[PDB]
Amino acid sequence: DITFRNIRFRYKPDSPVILDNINLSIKQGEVIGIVGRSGSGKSTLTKLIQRFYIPENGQVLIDGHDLALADPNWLRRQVGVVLQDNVLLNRSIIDNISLANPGMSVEKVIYAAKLAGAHDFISELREGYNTIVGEQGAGLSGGQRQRIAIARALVNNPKILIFDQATSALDYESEHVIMRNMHKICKGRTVIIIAHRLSTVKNADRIIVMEKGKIVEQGKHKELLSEPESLYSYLYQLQSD
Numbered sequence: 001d002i003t004f005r006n007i008r009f010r011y012k013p014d015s016p017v018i019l020d021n022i023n024l025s026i027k028q029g030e031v032i033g034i035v036g037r038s039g040s041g042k043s044t045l046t047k048l049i050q051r052f053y054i055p056e057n058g059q060v061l062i063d064g065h066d067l068a069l070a071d072p073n074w075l076r077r078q079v080g081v082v083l084q085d086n087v088l089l090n091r092s093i094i095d096n097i098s099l100a101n102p103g104m105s106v107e108k109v110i111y112a113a114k115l116a117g118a119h120d121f122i123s124e125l126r127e128g129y130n131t132i133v134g135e136q137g138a139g140l141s142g143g144q145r146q147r148i149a150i151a152r153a154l155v156n157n158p159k160i161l162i163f164d165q166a167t168s169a170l171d172y173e174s175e176h177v178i179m180r181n182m183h184k185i186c187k188g189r190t191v192i193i194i195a196h197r198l199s200t201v202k203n204a205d206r207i208i209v210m211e212k213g214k215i216v217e218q219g220k221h222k223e224l225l226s227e228p229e230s231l232y233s234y235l236y237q238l239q240s241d
């Protein structure tokens with residue numbers, strides 16, 4: 001379980017309130033999508049699960065434990081994040097993917113790659129997985145980088161997986177390949193999906209809709225879509241005109 005109890009958050013002392021009174025209970029094993037306008041508070045919400053920031057009011061709880069008194073080491077074993085851009089390092093591919101403990105798993109890093117749809121193009125490279133990449137990937141293209149980051153997050157094997165717009169740099173096919181693998185990706189873990197590409201959330205158990213820091217609507221894709229006055233339906237309406 002993940003719990004937000006009466007959460008109020010602003011980044012700085014004098015600064016404006018970003019999250020005003022958030023109450024959310026992510027059940028264990030739930031696949032939940034978070035959508036909403038740019039600047040609505042989606043990634044800020046997820047920042048508080050990792051405790052980069054602590055709220056001025058209310059509490060965040062993971063499986064009963066209060067995060068403000070939790071062990072920081074323990075917390076980082078719970079949460080795995082495919083971040084925005086999610087900067088890599090100036091070394092080989094295997095060490096990038098194997099950041100969450102290397103010297104670990106011969107053919108299972110490959111499994112993570114296959115799941116991310118990265119194993120395919122990795123084959124053709126000069127030293128394969130031992131291919132040395134740079135700061136701005138001496139080799140890597142945008143969507144190729146991104147799939148490495150998905151491979152990295154999966155290798156973690158976290159109880160909670162934050163999928164922070166992790167198909168933003170991919171073609172519809174690379175995305176479609178990952179979505180077919182989502183069932184394996186999610187199997188026996190809690191998955192939060194931040195999406196502006198609403199098709200990444202079609203099959204989520206629950207879509208939560210954010211506006212100006214508040215959870216305004218919730219429901220399954222079909223249910224939200226069949227309410228013609230919903231903000232979600234209006235957003236889905238706009239793509240492809």
Ligand SMILES: Nc1ncnc2c1ncn2[C@@H]1O[C@H](COP(=O)(O)OP(=O)(O)OP(=O)(O)O)[C@@H](O)[C@H]1O
Pocket residue numbers: 011012018036037038039040041042043044045
């Ligand atoms: N580090 C920060 N310091 C101060 N304010 C911030 C910071 N990060 C974000 N904000 C403010 O928090 C609000 C929401 O930001 P957040 O990134 O959570 O929104 P989002 O829904 O993820 O946006 P996006 O769809 O553009 O990625 C915005 O008004 C933003 O200006």
